[PDB]
Design a protein around this ligand. Structure first.
Ligand SMILES: [Y+3]
Length: 118
């Protein structure tokens, strides 16, 4: 309900065997990327926040990650962002700078809301 922070269609990007490049994970197809909160117990107390990417054609979950307060966000272009949570990285190729900005507020609110509870 008020559990979702953002939902956009984008292409999931993974860091390549090269050194500093990014490529789309598998297909070049769009995925349904959402950011959401999952209550530990009480619907309004402490919770965990996840980023989830589901490929549109075969509904395969190609990305699933738990947000953490220390996470780093990187706006490279107005249409390409990538983040680092602990040791690994994921990135997104948005369809518009709009979607990108909407998603960014989303992740931002979610991160700030992480300690809501204790
Ligand atoms: Y808040």
């Amino acid at each position: 309900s008020h559990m979702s922070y953002a939902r956009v269609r984008a292409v999931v990007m993974t860091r390549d065997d090269s050194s500093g490049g990014w490529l789309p994970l598998g297909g070049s197809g769009l995925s349904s990327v959402t950011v959401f909160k999952v209550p530990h117990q009480e619907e309004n107390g402490c919770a965990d926040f996840f980023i989830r990417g589901e490929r549109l054609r075969d509904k395969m979950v190609v990305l699933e990650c738990m947000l953490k307060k220390d996470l780093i966000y990187n706006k490279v272009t107005p249409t390409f962002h990538h983040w680092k949570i602990d040791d690994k990285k994921f990135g997104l190729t948005f369809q518009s700078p709009a979607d990108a900005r909407a998603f960014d507020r989303g992740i931002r609110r979610a991160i700030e809301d992480i300690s809501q509870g204790c």
